Amino acid sequence: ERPTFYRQELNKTIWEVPERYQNLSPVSGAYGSVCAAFDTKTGLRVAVKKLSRPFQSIIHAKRTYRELRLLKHMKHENVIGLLDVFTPARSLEEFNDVYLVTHLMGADLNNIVKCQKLTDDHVQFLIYQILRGLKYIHSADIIHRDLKPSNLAVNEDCELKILDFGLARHTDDEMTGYVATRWYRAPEIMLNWMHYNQTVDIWSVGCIMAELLTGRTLFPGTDHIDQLKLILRLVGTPGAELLKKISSESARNYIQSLTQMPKMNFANVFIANPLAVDLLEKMLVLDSDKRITAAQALAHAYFAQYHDPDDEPVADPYDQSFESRDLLIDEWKSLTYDEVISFVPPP
Structure with missing residues (x-):
């Protein structure tokens, strides 16, 4: 389950990703920066997006939570599917950064x-x-x-x-x-x-x-x-x-x-x-x-x-009941952490 991480820094920010992903090449933004990489598990080339401090504000945290839950709910041929989601954090108290990995076509x-x-x-x-x-x-x-x-x-x-x-x-x-x-x-x-x-x-x-x-x-x-x-x-x-x-x-x-x-x-x-x-x-x-x-x-x-x-x-209807509330930052972060931990890679 828990893989080994290696710490790489690009554009003066750290990228802690599993050894599963190699050859990180950047591809930069206000809410998140993305790197291209090769997945040694699937043999495919992938895009790895790191959310920049996703829980610095209610706006960022809300965006992170909703994007993560949408991708985990989106299962359609013409919609990008979430291949992996991980965090170097080993506990909720250390949870800060969120990484998303997805298919990289032409x-x-x-x-x-x-x-x-x-x-x-x-x-x-x-x-x-x-x-x-x-x-x-x-x-x-x-x-x-x-x-x-x-x-x-x-x-x-x-x-x-x-x-x-x-x-x-x-x-x-x-x-x-x-x-x-x-x-x-x-x-x-x-x-x-x-x-x-x-x-x-x-x-x-x-x-x-x-x-x-x-x-x-x-x-x-x-x-x-x-x-x-x-x-x-x-x-x-x-x-x-x-x-x-x-x-x-x-x-x-x-x-x-x-x-x-x-x-x-x-x-x-x-x-x-x-x-x-x-x-x-x-x-x-x-x-x-x-x-x-x-x-x-x-x-x-x-x-x-x-x-x-x-x-x-x-599609089946989407359940925004958790979002319909005005939650505090720590509650959004806990929801996002639970959503990360509950991820099961697709076949």
Whole structure:
């Protein structure tokens, strides 16, 4: 059970990992840093993410606990699976750092697009797999909140996984608010502060598909204002009845202060498979109540070559009852420790 650890330091921070993992090569962040390594047990190359002081604040501890419990609950073909989770600490009193180990496929779409020319046949399969994973994710009342090309890994056979559930969580009615990445963030995140829902992921998938089809970012906003401007330059300025639904009065006033430019023609900007254009238009919509769902997306004609209702699974519901409480730091840490100890490696 208990393995032997060796202490390696990189970028002036210690990495205490089992001998099982060798050849640590870094790949850095606010909440966690990642190293690539070879697993002598499985013979596969793996990615090892060390959470940076996961229990320094309620925010960090809550993120650590929820990501760990999500990955342990996620069991789907197009979702990254947790191979190992360990800690050098031999007791709860010593527990501080948390390490996550997961499969390491070829490269992510970010690097891939910059050196490979993609076919429409590739985009079909890729976005089909993305939506296939999203159906599973959303069915568990989970929301990813950070779908971007760098959080999607793929191999030469075009089989992909959804990565990085660090911002994901169980969907509630009021949430963190400032989430996702600027160039893939849905409008309802910037307006209607803290009262978005699962529909945000579909906007990210639409941006992903547009970028894969064209080869360049769809909304390369310099800042938040530039993001809103680039979005409305395509999807068109909203309507009065939609404006009343915006919770922020400042947001309504700013939107009204803008020079009204309508929805440009969907077949004029992606001059491209018409079916993909139709689907994009179903996805890139302002009103979340009228945006296409992942379940509805899979049934789209664009995925006829891969759609299979019998093989599109659905997840069991996720139990956030432990999180629904306002716990202290030590209680979050104890829950995370119990979750680490209770891990059983997958076949």
